[PDB]
Amino acid sequence: MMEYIDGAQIALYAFWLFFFGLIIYLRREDKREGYPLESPQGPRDGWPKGAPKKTYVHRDHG
Amino acid sequence: MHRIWLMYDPRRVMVALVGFLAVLALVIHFVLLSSQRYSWIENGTLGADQAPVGASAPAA
Amino acid sequence: MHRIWLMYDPRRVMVALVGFLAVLALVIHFVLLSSQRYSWIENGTLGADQAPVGASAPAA
Amino acid sequence: MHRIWLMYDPRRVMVALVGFLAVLALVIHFVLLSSQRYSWIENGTLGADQAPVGASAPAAAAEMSPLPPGR
Amino acid sequence: HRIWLMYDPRRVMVALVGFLAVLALVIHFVLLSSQRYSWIENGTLGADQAPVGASAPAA
Amino acid sequence: MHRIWLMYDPRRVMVALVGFLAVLALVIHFVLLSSQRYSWIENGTLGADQAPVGASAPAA
Amino acid sequence: MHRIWLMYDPRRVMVALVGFLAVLALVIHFVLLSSQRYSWIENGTLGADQAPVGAS
Amino acid sequence: SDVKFVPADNYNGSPIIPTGNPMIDGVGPASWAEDRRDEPDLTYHGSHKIVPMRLDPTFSIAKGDPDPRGLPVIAADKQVAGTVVELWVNRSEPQVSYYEVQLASGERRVLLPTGYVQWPNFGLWGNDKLLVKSITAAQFANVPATKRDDQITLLEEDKICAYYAGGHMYAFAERSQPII
Amino acid sequence: GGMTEEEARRFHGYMVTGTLGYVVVASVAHFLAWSWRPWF
Amino acid sequence: GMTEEEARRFHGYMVTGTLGYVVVASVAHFLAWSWRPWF
Amino acid sequence: GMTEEEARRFHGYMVTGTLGYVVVASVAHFLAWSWRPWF
Amino acid sequence: GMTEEEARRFHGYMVTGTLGYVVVASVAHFLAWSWRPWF
Amino acid sequence: GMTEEEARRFHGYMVTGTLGYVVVASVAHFLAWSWRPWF
Amino acid sequence: GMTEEEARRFHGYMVTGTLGYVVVASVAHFLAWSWRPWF
Amino acid sequence: AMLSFEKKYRVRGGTLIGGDLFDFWFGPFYVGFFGVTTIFFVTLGTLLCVWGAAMGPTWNLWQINIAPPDLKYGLGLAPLREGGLWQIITLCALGAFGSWALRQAEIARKLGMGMHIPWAYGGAILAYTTLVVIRPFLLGAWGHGFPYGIFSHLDWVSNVGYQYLHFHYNPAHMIAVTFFFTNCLALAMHGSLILSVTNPPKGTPTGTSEQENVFFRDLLGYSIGAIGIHRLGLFLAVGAAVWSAICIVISGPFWTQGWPEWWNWWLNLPIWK
Amino acid sequence: SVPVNDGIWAWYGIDDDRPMAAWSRFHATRCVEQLAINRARVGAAEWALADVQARGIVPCIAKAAAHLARARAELADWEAQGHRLEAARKVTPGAWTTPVI
Amino acid sequence: MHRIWMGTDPHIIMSALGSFLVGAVLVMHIWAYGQFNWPATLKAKYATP
């Protein structure tokens, strides 16, 4: 009985909340290299703060 | 004339020749089969005077 | 003249020529076959006076 | 101008020349074959006075128009 | 005459020929597409018979 | 005066110049050919008093 | 006043300036060329009292 | 004095200027990842990934392609730098990673990455000299050496590749300047 | 490899005989076709 | 390897085969014109 | 880097060229104004 | 590379080939003109 | 680069080149004006 | 490698060839004009 | 601010125009001469878009619509409120996109990179230039361009398609679509493979090029290899834009009928006419 | 397939590697180029064999010996062309003053 | 006065002069054929009734 609110609109805002969540996650992943930034005012992290640098386990011998 | 087979590998030539004749034969048969006059599977039993002829000049 | 066969490989030029003639001949036949005047598979038995001619100039 | 044969490998100049002439020949033939006047495969047996000529001016009737009315 | 020091003839000659070949082909097809000079179809018309574009209406 | 050619490579400036003039010449010829008054390939034989003119302002 | 050429190397300004003015001249001519009052290629012969005026 | 560069001025976005030869010091497009691990790259089975073809008997040139060995190398100043005498192969994805060039003007053999070689006529014909646009024939003498001649570390790969990459800016003084 | 001049002439004789035999069959085919339904 | 004698010999065959092909095509056009002239 | 006397020499040309251009443009506007005024 | 001896020899084959082609082409044009003039 | 004398001689050709070009254009404009004037 | 002799000789061919072409094209325009004038 | 490794890369040189004059950064961004011309055209074009919104009927983002002129204006500039504004914005767009590609070339030259990125972007610029310059020029009026509005340009796409009754039958469009779909499939496989070797299940060792190669070869039957998949992705993505440019430039200038009746040539091949 | 050195031009019959007993300037140019390359290629192949013998890696020694033998065979093929062109150069009047080999 | 020809190529000079004359003479003839009504009177003389 809500006239303006309809399921297609509800779905679309559900997607927007997921999508803006996804962009945040990807921008955290993008900062695992090269961060924190150098600046004349000291280190800078940008936003969001980056995920930490990964360490990779090599194949033990072969 | 047999010196031509020294200039070309005869097994390459025979492959190219036989493939050419196969395709050419099929192309001619399908052209004829699609025609009106030579649609022999439907009308092959017609006599030469009964068979279709394409339209002439009007000459009206 | 004949020293051209030093400048070019006979074995190779012959393949290029024979391929070119095959393509040229097939093109000319298919251009004729799709005309009205020379659709010989349908109308080849018409006499020369009786075969189609493209539309003339006369007009109002 | 025979010094042109010093500037290039003559074998390659013949290959380029044959290409240019062959392509230009086919261009002019298919242009003519597409025209009304020189559609020789259909109308080649017409006499020169019978062969088509492009109109100097089409007529019209004042209510007729070739294109629909626009905005 | 020293311009030929700055440009290689083996390049220049092809560049000039390519320019002229394109320009000539352009002018022919522009004329052929016109009504007055569609000479394949209408070249046998006399100069008074050949088409002329529309004039000023004066009204 | 000639110290302009000490500031800039003359070869570059000649290629820049000729490119600009060629495009400019083509644009102006196209603008004229695309107009009514100067569509010279179709109407070039008209006299100066019969060539088109764009409309005036109204009388009031 | 001449010290702007100690900030900006003049040979690198003058190429930029020419481009800006070439584009600006082309833009102004085309704006005029397709106005009613100044379409001189088609109405240049009119004379000032006969030339269109954009009244409405 | 051992810092490789200085700021061009004090403003925030200003470029740096190299203090020495930037191709050798590794500044700008000549720089490499100086922290990169100084060990060889390894295959899935743990053997050295990049090795001279002479040391793996399973590898060979593809039958239709030119054999680069013995061909002259033509440098950026169109002088002959040397001739190819060995190929180095990637054993994980079979390809030629480097040519090894015997220098004409000395006793060194140096590596030349495949990505810096152009074939005449884009390889459509000729196929009888190698073209190295990046560096002059004199600059080949300073190409970084590998510690061994049967293997190459990930650091040496970065140093060698960075050296040729720098030549597109630093080989001649004019390459750094604008075209207009 | 290659082919010897004796092998070339030996091949050529069969090649001609094949081509001739094939042309003969095609000739009979065209004459049967012609007498059934002429195309000119 | 190819001698000038072999270039001369091949030229003989190539010219003869070309001309013989053009002759056969001439007879074809003679027959085609007899059946249905195109001018 | 350019010296101050080179900069001073160029400045004289650059002023003169600019002002000459502006003078020519002013004459062009005078002709355009006479032919068809825009105010 | 190319000698003048070959360059001059070769130009003779070019001229005769060219002339032969132009002779045939101009006969072909005059035949076409007789059949259907384009002016 | 170029010597100031070599610049000096180049400029003379560039000037006379520009002058010859302007001259042809000026004649072309007067012909166009005599055929179909635009003011 | 260019020389002033090579340049001066080549200049003669380019000048004479250009002018000869412009002569043949001037006749082509004379013929075109006589057939169907464009002014 | 700079990445932790960045400073040693910030040298002078590699410009095409301007030299040292603009050879500096602003935050992360490289400026350069084409940076200056980028900001000029971006700013002028964007503010003229805002002006177009102001004199139109609404500020609703989805509904703003800066339309090209009527076809009657041909190749002239129309009155600014009658579509001449769309024409000025189009010049700014062409200037901004061209400046962006040349700035990318200056950046790539400064880093010693190949010119692949500027030229790949040229594919997109070609499609835009086809839509607003080349196709309208061949049709003889700028009014054939698409309008600048988030949904009104979709109305243009709809109507242009139905100008040819059934635009799916356009043969270049079928190829362009196939490239777009094949590109998206290939991108999902390349992304998946690299991630799945670099992020294996917990406690598994990091994967290798050999494992990637083996798995891919079970998917397509053949190994593409490392450089091959990036060549393929570039071929597919740029070919999609090039075939898009072809499919729209043939619609109108060269083919005017419905697209289904173009396929009449296939039905009339002589083997089965 | 196309040959390596004339490549695309082999489709048009240009094929300067073919065994030529007449004098021909194009084949002579090609033979001088290919001799220098193949002499260097033999020199490389025997340096490679010496290196692998020093390392003592038998299957690599075996292949390097096989490669050297193949490289020698290709050089002999070009030296045969060089000599037969040399024989023709002496007698055909227009030919080079410099030897081919 | 002859020094004006120093540094020239005589084959260029004759090429330029010859081409100028051919251009000028053609222009002068087609102009003169326009003004003088000739060969238009010549054609009308021998033309068929």
Ligand SMILES: CCCCCCCCCCCCCC(=O)OC[C@H](COP(=O)(O)OCC(O)COP(=O)(O)OC[C@@H](COC(=O)CCCCCCCCCCCCC)OC(=O)CCCCCCCCCCCCC)OC(=O)CCCCCCCCCCCCC
């Ligand atoms: C349609 C479906 C597909 C659509 C697909 C769209 C995909 C878009 C993906 C890219 C968007 C992010 C771009 C980016 O990260 O730029 C770097 C910049 C700064 O962070 P940093 O790089 O890590 O650190 C540097 C900085 O801290 C210090 O740098 P410096 O001192 O040298 O320079 C000065 C500062 C000043 O800061 C700014 O100016 C930032 C202004 C950012 C405005 C644009 C935000 C767009 C968000 C779009 C997502 C969505 C927003 C709703 O730094 C800079 O100068 C950095 C300049 C970066 C310029 C980026 C311009 C991107 C414009 C994209 C427009 C996209 C329009 C669609 O980041 C930010 O400022 C924060 C961005 C956060 C990620 C967006 C997440 C939004 C989630 C929803 C809201 C969350 C609210 C809490």
Ligand code: BCL
């Ligand atoms: C064998 C070496 C020569 C040759 C030697 C001769 C001789 C010798 C004579 C001819 C004759 C003729 N030749 Mg011849 N001819 C050759 C190649 C050709 C080619 C060709 C495509 O290459 C063509 C079109 C011709 C065409 C012709 C005719 C115009 C002409 C009349 C006979 C005829 O109809 O022959 C039909 C044959 C063909 C069209 C093709 C096959 C050619 C045959 C194999 C050549 C010998 C034909 C000869 C007549 C045989 C009998 C005469 C003997 C001396 C007893 N020849 C070869 C290259 N030719 C005769 C002539 O001019 O009479 C006035 C003549 O006396």
Ligand code: BCL
């Ligand atoms: C190397 C020779 C010189 C040269 C030397 C001469 C000489 C000498 C004479 C001419 C003459 C003429 N030249 Mg010339 N001329 C050259 C190049 C040209 C070019 C050109 C495109 O380059 C053109 C358009 C002309 C044009 C002309 C005409 C104005 C005129 C009549 C002949 C003609 O039409 O020849 C068209 C051009 C050609 C076919 C090519 C040039 C060479 C040929 C052989 C013609 C000129 C020589 C002529 C037959 C000599 C006759 C005997 C003398 C009267 C004593 N010359 C070259 C560069 N020219 C004659 C003249 O002045 O008459 C008033 C004349 O006596």
Ligand SMILES: CC[C@H]1c2cc3[nH]c4c(c3C)C(=O)[C@H](C(=O)OC)c4c3nc(cc4[nH]c(cc(n2)[C@@H]1C)c(C(C)=O)c4C)[C@@H](C)[C@@H]3CCC(=O)OC/C=C(\C)CCC[C@H](C)CCC[C@H](C)CCCC(C)C
């Ligand atoms: C060629 C294959 C595909 C491609 C590739 C591609 N795009 C690229 C690149 C590449 C390789 C870049 O390097 C470049 C880049 O830097 O990306 C981050 C870019 C890029 N592709 C972009 C977008 C984009 N690409 C698209 C398409 C494609 N890009 C192709 C399918 C589309 C489509 C289909 O809609 C869009 C929207 C940008 C993010 C970026 C180019 C950025 C740029 O040019 O920046 C300078 C200009 C501005 C920031 C703004 C200009 C504003 C104007 C002056 C005013 C507005 C006028 C405009 C016409 C209005 C339009 C309104 C719409 C609602 C219709």
Ligand SMILES: COC(C)(C)C/C=C/C(C)=C/C=C/C(C=O)=C/C=C/C(C)=C/C=C/C=C(C)/C=C/C=C(\C)CC/C=C(C)/C=C/C=C(\C)C(=O)O
């Ligand atoms: C619709 O109409 C449109 C299309 C619009 C209209 C337009 C059409 C146009 C433009 C047409 C153009 C046509 C053209 C133009 O050039 C056509 C030119 C055609 C040509 C050149 C044909 C040449 C044929 C030559 C042949 C067949 C040679 C055969 C040789 C043979 C058999 C012998 C080989 C050697 C041997 C056997 C010896 C080996 C010895 C050895 C090994 C030894 O001795 O060791």
Ligand SMILES: COC(C)(C)C/C=C/C(C)=C/C=C/C(C=O)=C/C=C/C(C)=C/C=C/C=C(C)/C=C/C=C(\C)CC/C=C(C)/C=C/C=C(\C)C(=O)O
């Ligand atoms: C539709 O209507 C809309 C468009 C919307 C309406 C609005 C329009 C608007 C807003 C317009 C704005 C216009 C504008 C604003 O400023 C325009 C600004 C114009 C300007 C500044 C022009 C400047 C020109 C300068 C020139 C020509 C200089 C030439 C110099 C020369 C030749 C000499 C160089 C030195 C040499 C050679 C050294 C030799 C010696 C040496 C080396 C030695 O001796 O060493």
Ligand SMILES: COC(C)(C)C/C=C/C(C)=C/C=C/C(C=O)=C/C=C/C(C)=C/C=C/C=C(C)/C=C/C=C(\C)CC/C=C(C)/C=C/C=C(\C)C(=O)O
């Ligand atoms: C209708 O509308 C549109 C289309 C728009 C209208 C407009 C059209 C336009 C613009 C047309 C332009 C046309 C044009 C312009 O230039 C056309 C130019 C044509 C030309 C140049 C033709 C030249 C032909 C030359 C030939 C064939 C030479 C052959 C030589 C041969 C065979 C000999 C080979 C060597 C041998 C045998 C032996 C060597 C021995 C050696 C080495 C030894 O013995 O050592």
Ligand SMILES: COC(C)(C)C/C=C/C(C)=C/C=C/C(C=O)=C/C=C/C(C)=C/C=C/C=C(C)/C=C/C=C(\C)CC/C=C(C)/C=C/C=C(\C)C(=O)O
């Ligand atoms: C629709 O209407 C719209 C379009 C909208 C309206 C708007 C119109 C507008 C805005 C027009 C703008 C026009 C314009 C500017 O702005 C126009 C500027 C024109 C100019 C400057 C032309 C210059 C021409 C110069 C030429 C041809 C030189 C020729 C000769 C040269 C070079 C020498 C050859 C010899 C050499 C080289 C060897 C020397 C010796 C050597 C080397 C030695 O000895 O070493």
Ligand SMILES: COC(C)(C)C/C=C/C(C)=C/C=C/C(C=O)=C/C=C/C(C)=C/C=C/C=C(C)/C=C/C=C(\C)CC/C=C(C)/C=C/C=C(\C)C(=O)O
């Ligand atoms: C219709 O509507 C639109 C289109 C819109 C209207 C507008 C149209 C417009 C804008 C037109 C512009 C036209 C134009 C502008 O510039 C046109 C310019 C034309 C020009 C420049 C023509 C020049 C031709 C030159 C030629 C042919 C040279 C021939 C030389 C020959 C033969 C000799 C070769 C030398 C050799 C071999 C060397 C031997 C010695 C050696 C090697 C040694 O000695 O070493």
Ligand SMILES: CCCCCCCCCCCCO[C@@H]1O[C@H](CO)[C@@H](O[C@H]2O[C@H](CO)[C@@H](O)[C@H](O)[C@H]2O)[C@H](O)[C@H]1O
């Ligand atoms: C006297 C005759 C002697 C035998 C002649 C044999 C002729 C063979 C066919 C000639 C025509 C082939 O067609 C012609 O091929 C050449 C080959 O470079 C093309 O040439 C062009 O394309 C090729 C690739 O295709 C490029 O490598 C080349 O650099 C470029 O010039 C021409 O664009 C084309 O028109």
Ligand SMILES: CCCCCCCCCCCCO[C@@H]1O[C@H](CO)[C@@H](O[C@H]2O[C@H](CO)[C@@H](O)[C@H](O)[C@H]2O)[C@H](O)[C@H]1O
């Ligand atoms: C439709 C396809 C082609 C149909 C045409 C077939 C050819 C018809 C005519 C053939 C006539 C005989 O043709 C003739 O054969 C002889 C060998 O017998 C060739 O003779 C050639 O080789 C001999 C050596 O064997 C050389 O000494 C001689 O100089 C050379 O010309 C001739 O060059 C050719 O002219």
